[PDB]
From a paper:
The ubiquitin E3 ligase cereblon (CRBN) is the target of therapeutic drugs thalidomide and lenalidomide and is recruited by most targeted protein degraders (PROTACs and molecular glues) in clinical development. CRBN consists of an unstructured N-terminal region and three folded domains: the Lon protease-like domain (Lon), the helical bundle (HB) which facilitates binding to the adaptor protein DDB1, and the thalidomide binding domain (TBD). We present the design of CRBNmidi, a construct that readily expresses from E. coli with high yields as soluble, stable protein without DDB1. Importantly, the stabilizing mutations introduced based on PROSS analysis proved to have beneficial effects, with the best-expressing construct (construct 8, hereafter referred to as CRBNmidi) incorporating 12 mutations.
We next solved the ternary crystal structure of CRBNmidi in complex with PROTAC CFT-1297 and BRD4BD2 to a resolution of 2.9 Å. We chose compound CFT-1297 as a BET PROTAC degrader for crystallographic studies because it is reported to exhibit positive cooperativity of ternary complex formation, and was previously characterized by hydrogen-deuterium exchange mass spectrometry (HDX-MS), providing some low-resolution structural information. The crystal structure contains two protomers in the asymmetric unit, indicating flexibility in the ternary complex. The two protomers show a slightly different bound pose of the BRD4BD2 molecules relative to CRBN, caused by a tilt of 27° of the PROTAC around the piperidine moiety that connects the CRBN binder and the alkyl linker. The bromodomain docks sideways on top of the CRBN TBD, an orientation imposed by the long rigid alkyl linker of the PROTAC. The surface of the bromodomain most buried within the complex comprise the region from the end of the Z-helix to the middle of the ZA-loop, including the αZ’ helix from the ZA loop (residues 362–378). This region packs against the central linker region of the PROTAC at one end, and the CRBN TBD between the sensor loop and residues 390–396 at the other end, where a hydrogen bond is predicted between the side chains of Tyr372BRD4 and Gln390CRBN. The remainder of the ZA loop (residues 379–400) and the whole BC-loop are solvent-exposed within the ternary complex structure, as well as the Lon domain of CRBN which is also fully solvent-exposed. Additional protein-protein hydrophobic contacts are also observed as the C-helix of the bromodomain (residues 438–449) is found packed against CRBN at the opposite side of the TBD, with the side chains of Glu438BRD4 and Arg373CRBN at this interface located within a potential salt-bridge distance. Furthermore, by capturing two orientations of BRD4BD2 this crystal structure provides structural insight into complex flexibility that could be challenging to visualize by other techniques, such as cryoEM, in which flexibility can limit resolution.
Numbering used by the authors:
A (entry chain B): 337 to 366, 369 to 458
B (entry chain A): 44 to 187, 250 to 266, 271 to 425
Amino acid sequence: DSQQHPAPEKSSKVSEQLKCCSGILKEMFAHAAYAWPFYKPVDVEALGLHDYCDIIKHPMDMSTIKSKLEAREYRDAQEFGADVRLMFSNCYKYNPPDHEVVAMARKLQDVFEMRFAKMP
Amino acid sequence: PNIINFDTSLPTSHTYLGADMEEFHGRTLHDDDSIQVIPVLPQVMMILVPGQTLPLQLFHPQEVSMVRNLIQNDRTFAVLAYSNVQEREAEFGTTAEIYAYREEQDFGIEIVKVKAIGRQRFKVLELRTQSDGIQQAKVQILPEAETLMDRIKKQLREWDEDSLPSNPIDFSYWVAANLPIDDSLRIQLLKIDSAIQRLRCELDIMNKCTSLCCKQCQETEITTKNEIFSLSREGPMAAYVNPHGYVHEILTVYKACNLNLIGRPSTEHSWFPGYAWTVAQCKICASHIGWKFTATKKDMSPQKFWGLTRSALIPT
Ligand SMILES: Cc1nnc2n1-c1ccc(-c3cnn(CCCCCCCN4CCC(c5cccc6c5CN([C@H]5CCC(=O)NC5=O)C6=O)CC4)c3)cc1C(c1ccc(Cl)cc1)=NC21CC1
Ligand SMILES: [Zn+2]
């Protein structure tokens, strides 16, 4: 029940290869069928589930990743790919393998792995 | 085969895009063999036939600027027919006229949603890239059988159950747009200036028809020409646009095979009001062929009708 930092104020700023990551995010954001989960921060009171945040200490969502990509918070691409991978990994812990959400995430993770192999 | 409680007019109105749009009823028809300069849409790659309706949605700043100039001047833009989609090479095409326009500022980003109907066929003569990178094309307008319509209408009735136009040129285009054929045959029919030759070739093309499978793995037969039915006034194949801006040409069939349904039914952005969509994908390649539509009221006789994207199919 707390939003992750979308933009900082004291960090340095660099602009290299993060433009390519914006094209990757554009392919997943808009694929778009299963993007509406993991779009915005997971909402525990509306879902009724009062155990999600206790199971997953770190909250990562596509929109948070987008806001950090615009304020140039990331100085290295690795931190982004780690954050995207963390979003998928968290889903696989709370949800069982037969759940549809686990099937949705797999398709996105396949697209993400394909596009992140054309790094410049 | 079943009765229809659905209103064929509601899908044509395109309520999903909006409802309070400005309407232009003026019509402009250039003279045959005249030469004209027409700007082209940068993202469209479909092959439009005269009388077909194109729903559009544009986000990019260079694109809204062209639409605003078009409304002030003659409201006409060109949609080309490319032999290779990746390439920008084209030879023929059809003009499109905006009859509906709406501007919207969503979160500070200017949004235009327009609806246009194709008017006249043309031949590309030259295409230069504008200073803003939005190519303008110099083209030349191209000039343009009761027993024949009978045989076509007879066979068409065998495929599915006065909806068809009565005029010759109007009937030829209807068949060409709604036939389950390859886009190579669409270009060939467009190149045919006369209506008589076009109707005779449509009869030959429809008699020999093949089933459709998925384009990615080409291993699962999806549907046949006998399962086709028309849920809209335009016909079985009509064009609809998704919220992000990509236009889909959807084929409405009554039954399909080899497709698994993922998720729960939802009504958000439903191209057919009154119905809910569930994503369907191939059991081999998992290519997300189309969406299956489930009704929300028990009074609608077509409770379930499939909706397939033409882009993911290839005739066998
Ligand atoms: C993350 C996480 N991790 N675990 C969980 N979640 C979750 C998080 C959030 C939510 C949630 C619930 N509600 N909302 C509330 C958030 C809801 C956001 C809005 C969702 C609907 N809009 C997006 C999809 C649509 C769209 C988009 C792109 C293209 C096209 C279309 C439609 N479309 C076509 C389709 C065909 C057609 O006819 N027309 C079209 O336009 C397209 O071309 C547009 C409408 C969000 C649930 C979950 C779930 C979950 C998810 C799904 C399901 Cl079945 C079951 C459970 N499970 C958990 C708790 C364990
Ligand atoms: Zn397949």
